[PDB]
């Protein structure tokens, strides 16, 4: 599903919280759970990014600057104005991070994490790990450098994902209750999301969550998606409701939705 609408709010997401986070001149943890291979072929042998990145990156010249580093990172990696490739998260991370700081990308799947050992490292300093990434927050937090961005992206291909993935977070923020932890979750089944939405709630007041929906008029499959962030950074609510808008005039206008929801203790 590369490109798909899940992944352009996940990624724009991700953008927003790297610009943050680089504006302090000490080094960053960044750690992916869910690296997968890092760059996507979408000319391989369904062509889902044309309902996702496709009308975004076509329209790129009428964005708001707030997806700049976005759109930068499409650029750098096609070779024309053509879409042949869409970025994973890892490329994104490699592109805005600094030389100073450590980038630490996991991946169960063997094929996929060896296709994650062919990305560029330009001057960053990436360790590729195949490791179940879910497992690892326990290891590696809290990190020696202090400051650190989580970035779990699950596939929720077991239900028992949506209670394992909110229980790894609640003992990773216990030992560092400080890091900037970042969730994608998905809207499939609404009972489901729900009760994963409960268990995030728990860890933390610091907290914010961000939704987009398709609202398509039959509820099959993937109808909406969002992120839960705790510790998110100053100004990132009312930058993320720009780009949560923005987004809902390209996927089915006049339809689509959003909705930003903060913990008792965040504004």
């Known amino acids: 599903h590369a490109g798909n609408f899940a992944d352009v709010i996940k990624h724009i997401t991700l953008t927003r919280l790297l610009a943050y986070l680089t504006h302090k001149d000490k080094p960053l943890f960044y750690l992916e759970t869910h690296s997968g291979r890092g760059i996507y072929d979408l000319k391989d042998k369904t062509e889902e990014y044309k309902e996702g990145i496709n009308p975004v990156w076509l329209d790129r010249e009428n964005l708001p600057s ?45 094929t996929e994490y060896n296709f994650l050992l062919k990305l560029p490292h330009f001057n960053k300093k990436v360790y590729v790990n195949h490791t179940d990434g879910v497992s690892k927050l326990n290891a590696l937090l809290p990190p020696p450098e202090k400051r650190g961005l989580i970035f779990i992206d699950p596939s929720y291909e077991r239900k028992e994902e949506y209670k394992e993935i909110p229980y790894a977070i609640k003992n990773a923020y216990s030992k560092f209750s400080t890091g900037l932890y970042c969730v994608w979750y998905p809207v499939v089944n609404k009972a489901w999301t729900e009760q994963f939405l409960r268990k995030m709630r728990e860890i933390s007041s ?16 993937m109808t909406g998606c969002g992120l839960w962030i705790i510790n998110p950074p100053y100004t990132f609510p009312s930058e993320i409701k720009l780009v949560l808008e923005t987004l809902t005039t390209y996927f089915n206008p006049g339809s689509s939705s959003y909705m930003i929801e903060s913990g008792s203790k965040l504004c």
């Open 66 to 110: 707030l997806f700049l580093e976005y759109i930068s990172v499409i650029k750098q990696i096609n070779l024309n104005s053509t879409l042949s490739y869409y970025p994973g998260s890892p490329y994104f991370a490699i592109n805005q991070l600094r030389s100073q700081d450590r980038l630490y990308l996991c991946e169960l799947h063997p």
């Open 206 to 221: 610091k907290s914010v969550r961000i939704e987009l929906h398709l609202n398509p008029l039959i509820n099959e499959g």
